[PDB]
């Protein structure tokens, strides 16, 4: 038809684009972090409406792009330093390019060996990392919000039977991720039987009253059946007491679940690998690739140490797939069946940049932090609230002569302040029942300055509305 | 950097990778749907090893073009007839190359307004097809897989509580898909909680039984909560009474799942939309976008009558994410937080064909079933076991001299024959307690020939194969 794209048409109307991005992006250390949409912009889409025919392709691209695209928080900028950023690399934008061009039917190894055995390579590779030496295994899921669940059923099925499995409880921390108890919740773990644990004030799990919460449980009738230890807490980025948790685990056959969505990839920097030392005693491990391995959404990793308990939980056997099946399908490893090989853009980029470019690129993460904390120290009324930890810091401006309410109001604004400034994007956390301000830095291409630049511009703004409240 | 690729090293990379695909997939129609790898394939990409130092990028761009995508069951081929084939409008993967490219985070209004704004216009879209005209609601999840656990999930949650879910029973058919009880076992209904009724010849589900076994369980002190209806069976593409199971469902007080995950897409067509009648009916359900809506892995949606049943079991306020919230972010309707915008590229693709074009791609799908079954009628020895039904159909090379073992034998080196020919990919399954040969054709550029030349190889291997023995 009249409206199909023909191979000519196809491939000019791509590079058009390939073009005019690479340009764009080209210049994005001098591009505001945030471009808000305007009043009237929700309605313009609205009527944009699903046309019975077709429309020029490029017509409709730049549509895209000035009406959509266009008004974003863009997190791929080196100044964007709120909740976790996606310094995603070139090469990973390029993985995805030929992944879906050949749109090859993974998780499924007869239909695709060689994109399966890609994959099974890195997952391999990752588990080395880990600490995992006898007889791992792995699926690349599309988030770790997926790869907590899909570990979580894994520590159900091998814990619980079906007659018992209502009694099981389960044992976080006061600042684990918000997506761990909502697993739970999916998998059939209600909330009363979630223990939340208190964390010290470096933000650790409490193990003495992790043990006597398990104890309790265990004389009132459940059967508790996992630990979720967290390595990189998305707060503050601490680390629970990993050694101590497992050891609690075997004394009590549970599950041990490292949480490590994000903090995992720093066991690919020499530096601060020891940080995550005793990962290897847990069973299984969450790991995003699309936060601290600089990959696009969404390429998350789960792993344990045990493949055999992942194909207790998702294995199947229709007479379809008769012909498909040793050698595991990622379908039998749970918990999707279709999809796109989400690791091959991993691998194209461990390939082109190499393992030791990217550890490095990490450990500039922490740097990053650090810098952000020097410029905050000498400063007056400038409250350090968690110290630079894992590329990660909290901090507010706190003038003594305010009270605790008008702090948050202050601190909050100073947040608003900068959005709008355009220099940087910081949003506002709770941390101990103060509403402070956060940055996480983890972009390879940010500066020192950048980081000393935003802190005298916070600091600006804070004495700013400091007098215009008074 | 050394290993680090600038703007014109990477928009270089990848014109020269576009222009080399496009070149290549261009004369697709003459190339091997299936190319084998050979035996030293695996231990040549176990010794490339993961470096430690940078490597050349077009170097490794066409050592994976080489010797990783290479090696593949091509479900975009034009003759690619089994299981569900992915026939991916190009749109679509032009869709995915800008979406990656801004790798704007999804899944979250305040941080991407219009983003947002593009996939619930769709959604509500897809829900006026469906025939959900209150309040819908929807999500694009990475797979149907997920968009059953998702709507199921929603289900256990309307209809059970803290304290008796664990009494919950759910009710599918013995063509129900695998994604199905495995997603129920997932969210805790386990195997002794599900109940598997029998379906008629037609392979629809014996309302029926369906009935008698809500009745037992309930009188035994079970609570049925949920009856998951088909719209189009994996097998044969069956659909399931969904008036019938409709009105059972009203009756028990249970929540009505179909999933659609094929055949959804065929309320976009003007001819054989009728089919399913009764789709409106149910509380949730699950759609495919890369299966019949011509898109890349992985974009399917769930769609919900009542939006507030996805919001109470997803629904999630943590001290962060405090500054970004009515108005929902697709978070706090699970079940991911973190999402790249996977409905765009579905947005791409409706306006740049038109929804006229898309419905009559899929209506050319039925055509090429039927072209199937007409060119095999005449043939001797060829049984239906399965007429064709959307764009899907089931059958069999069956000698009446031969035992029922070796009918079975010669349908599966009948499979096998013209797999390893590279003129058609075709596998096996089970039908009635016999091996079947099935055909699943929805590629809008194949023709009557490639139907027809298909069934004629499949006879002549066929009738090879019966003088061997
Ligand atoms: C009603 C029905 N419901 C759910 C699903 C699961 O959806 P995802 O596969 O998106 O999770 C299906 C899927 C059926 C398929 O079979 C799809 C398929 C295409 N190419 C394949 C290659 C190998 C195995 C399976 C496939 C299906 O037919
Ligand atoms: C330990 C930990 N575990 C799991 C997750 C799961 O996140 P996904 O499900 O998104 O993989 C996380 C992630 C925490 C975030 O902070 C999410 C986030 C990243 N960028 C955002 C932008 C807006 C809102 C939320 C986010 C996390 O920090
Ligand atoms: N790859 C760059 C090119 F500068 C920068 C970059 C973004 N994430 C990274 C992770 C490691 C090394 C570099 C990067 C891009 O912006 O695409
Ligand atoms: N778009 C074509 C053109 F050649 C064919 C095609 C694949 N899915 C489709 C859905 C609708 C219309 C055409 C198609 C391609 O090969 O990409």
């Not at 305007?38 to 025919?53: A, F, L, T, V």
Request: aromatic residues 8%; glycine residues 6%.
């Amino acid at each position: 038809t009249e409206y199909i794209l023909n191979s000519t048409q196809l491939e000019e109307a791509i590079k058009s684009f390939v073009h005019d991005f690479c340009a764009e992006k080209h210049e994005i250390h001098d591009q505001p972090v945030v471009v808000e949409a305007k009043e009237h912009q929700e309605d313009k889409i609205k009527q944009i409406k699903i046309p019975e025919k077709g429309r020029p392709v490029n017509e409709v691209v730049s549509e895209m792009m000035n009406e959509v695209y266009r008004y974003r928080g863009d997190a791929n900028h080196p100044r964007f330093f709120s909740f976790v950023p996606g310094p995603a690399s070139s090469v990973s934008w390029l993985g995805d390019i030929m992944t879906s061009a050949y749109n090859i039917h993974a998780g499924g190894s007869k239909l695709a060996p060689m994109v399966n055995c890609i994959e099974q390579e890195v997952l391999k590779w990752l588990a080395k990392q880990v600490g995992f030496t006898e007889n791992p295994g792995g699926v690349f899921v599309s988030g770790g919000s997926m790869a907590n669940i899909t570990a979580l059923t894994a520590a159900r099925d091998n814990k619980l039977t079906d007659i018992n499995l209502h009694l099981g409880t389960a044992y976080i921390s006061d600042q684990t991720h918000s997506s761990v108890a909502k697993g739970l919740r999916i998998i059939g773990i209600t909330d009363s039987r979630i223990r939340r644990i208190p964390t010290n004030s470096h933000f650790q799990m409490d193990t003495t009253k992790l043990e006597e919460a398990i104890e309790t449980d265990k004389k009132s009738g459940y059967i508790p059946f996992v630990v979720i230890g967290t390595a990189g807490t998305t707060n503050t980025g601490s680390i629970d007491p990993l050694t101590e948790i497992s050891a609690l685990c075997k004394k009590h056959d549970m599950w041990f679940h490292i949480d490590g969505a994000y903090g995992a990839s720093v066991l690919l920097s020499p530096k601060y690998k020891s940080l995550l030392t005793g990962t290897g005693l847990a069973d299984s491990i969450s790991w995003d690739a699309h936060k601290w391995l600089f990959q696009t959404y969404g390429c998350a990793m789960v792993l344990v140490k045990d493949i055999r308990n992942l194909f207790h939980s998702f294995h199947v056997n229709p007479e379809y797939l008769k012909d498909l099946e040793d050698n595991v399908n990622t379908w039998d490893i749970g918990m999707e069946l279709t999809r796109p090989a989400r690791g091959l853009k991993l691998w194209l980029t461990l390939q082109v940049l190499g393992s030791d470019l990217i550890g490095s690129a990490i450990e500039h993460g922490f740097q990053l932090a650090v810098w952000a904390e020097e410029a905050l120290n000498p400063k007056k009324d400038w409250e350090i609230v968690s110290p630079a930890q894992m590329a990660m810091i909290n901090f507010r401006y706190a003038p003594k002569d305010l009270t605790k309410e008008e702090q948050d109001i202050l601190n909050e604004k100073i947040s608003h302040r900068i959005l709008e400034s355009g220099y940087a994007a910081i949003f506002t956390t709770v941390l101990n029942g103060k509403t402070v301000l956060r940055i996480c830095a983890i972009h390879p291409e940010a500066t020192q300055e950048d980081m000393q630049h935003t802190i005298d511009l916070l600091d600006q703004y804070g004495r700013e509305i400091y007098t215009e409240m008074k």
